[PDB]
Amino acid sequence: NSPRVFCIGTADTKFDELRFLSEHVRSSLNSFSNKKVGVTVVDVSTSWKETNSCADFDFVPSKDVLSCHTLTRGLAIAIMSKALETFLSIANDEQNLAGVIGLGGSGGTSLLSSAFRSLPIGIPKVIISTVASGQTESYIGTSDLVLFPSVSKVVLSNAGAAFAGMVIGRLES
Amino acid sequence: NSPRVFCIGTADTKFDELRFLSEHVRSSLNSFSNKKVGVTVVDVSTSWKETNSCADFDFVPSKDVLSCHTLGEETMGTFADTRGLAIAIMSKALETFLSIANDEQNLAGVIGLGGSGGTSLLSSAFRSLPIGIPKVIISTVASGQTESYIGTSDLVLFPSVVDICGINNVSKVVLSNAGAAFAGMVIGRLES
């Protein structure tokens, strides 16, 4: 362990999408840096998925995010969104969060958005979303949340690379 | 010419923000490289407030942008006033300039600043570029209705958050981030 970065998937995101992104983030982190940042891959899908792991990455399945939470645009999302928010409010409270990146459609975006913009301005926070070109006010609110429009390796690549950029340059100042 | 990157804005009012961000794009591009990409600041202002250089950056004045463009349909557009006609002609002249840079495959990326007016100017031209070339816009409008600006492209809007215009505490951290985000996209694409 070390300072962490999170690649996050929602229901929407297919395994191979998340793998490519995490792989590209890590690589790029290593490549941009001047010599280290870990890549924790987290699943926050509201529906079950036949996979509680992501290649060789430190993982945290949807059951675990959820676990750390106590009890309106869906109940499922309302629940998980909250559980995510608390989850990385902790890892940021440990001063061990260099940024977060996730992908989702309209549902997944609205899940990640709120959980993300609850993080201090300046903390790299990225969402590769299919609702980027449209009304974003409700997602970005009044914060520095970046929405990359849509997934495709070329766009996964630039998003991934853009995130590595913000992180590294923020940590190497 | 080596790969090249344009940091674009209306320097007549955003000079400090442009310099600052380019300062950051440049050092990040350096830092993150393993090898050499130039940073060119370019002015698209249409006001009397004329600007001739930006620190020690390669610089192209708004009249240089203008001079590579032949007038077209833009001239006969609507327009509440002549400022808006200047903005439209400039926007199209940017489109040509960028397009020329990309035909001469100098073009490794574009980034820009702007409010409502800048963002329309940069949008229109940034999206004429093929998908994949890094194109970012630090805009006070990213939080709102973006369909207009991004259309169907890969253009990314960075929200301006705003501790205000100019440079201070929290606009700085988004400018840095935007800068480094852009740098990583450019290097990553070139060293991939």
For B65, the token pair is 């942008």
As for how many domains chain B has, the answer is 1
Strands A38-43 and A4-9, sheet pairing: parallel
Nearest Cα residue to A146 out of B10, B146, B23, B31: B146
> Distance (Å, rounded) from C-alpha B126 to C-alpha B107?
12
CB-based contacts of A138, cutoff 8 Å, min separation 6: A110, A113
Alpha helices (runs of H) in chain A, residue ranges in sequence order: 15-32, 62-67, 75-93, 106-117, 137-140, 153-171
Method: X-ray
Q: Enumerate chain A positions whose Cβ falls within 8 A of a Cβ in B.
A: 28, 31-32, 34, 121-122, 124, 132-137, 140-149, 154-155, 157-158, 160-166, 168-170, 172
Q: Torsion angle of alpha carbons A131, A137, A142, A147, nearest 10°?
A: 10
The label of the residue with tokens 């930006």 reads B54
CB contacts, 8 Å: A160 with chain B: 188
Q: Do B31 and A141 touch (CB under 8 A)?
A: no
Maximum separation of any 2 CA atoms in chain A, in Å: 44
Phi/psi of residue B72, nearest 5 degrees: -145, -140
Question: Residue B104: which domain range?
Answer: 1-192
Q: Count Cβ atoms below 10 Å from residue B148 Cβ, excluding itself.
A: 14
Q: How far apart are CA B150 and CA B119, in angstroms?
A: 10
* Resolution value, angstrom units: 2.8
User: In this structure, are residues A101 and A25 in contact, taking their beta carbons and an 8 Å threshold?
Assistant: yes
Select the residue from A136, A138, A139 to test the B interface by mutation, using most B Cβ atoms within 10 A.
A136
> Taking each helix axis from N to C terminus, what angle separates B169-190 and B11-32, rounded to the nearest 10 degrees?
50
| CA nearest to A163 within chain B | B181
Q: Do A162 and B182 touch (CB under 8 A)?
A: yes
Q: What is the rounded CA–CA span in Å between residue A82 and residue B23? A: 39
Could you list the beta-strand ranges (E) of chain B. Answer: 4-9, 38-43, 58-60, 107-114, 135-139, 156-159
Nearest-by-CA chain A residue for B159: A144
- The sign one gets for the Cα dihedral B113, B117, B120, B126 is negative
Amino acid residing at A61: P
Distances (CA, A) of B67 to A109, B1, B12, B121: 43, 21, 19, 17
Q: Residue B89 sits in a domain of what CATH number?
A: 3.40.50.12020
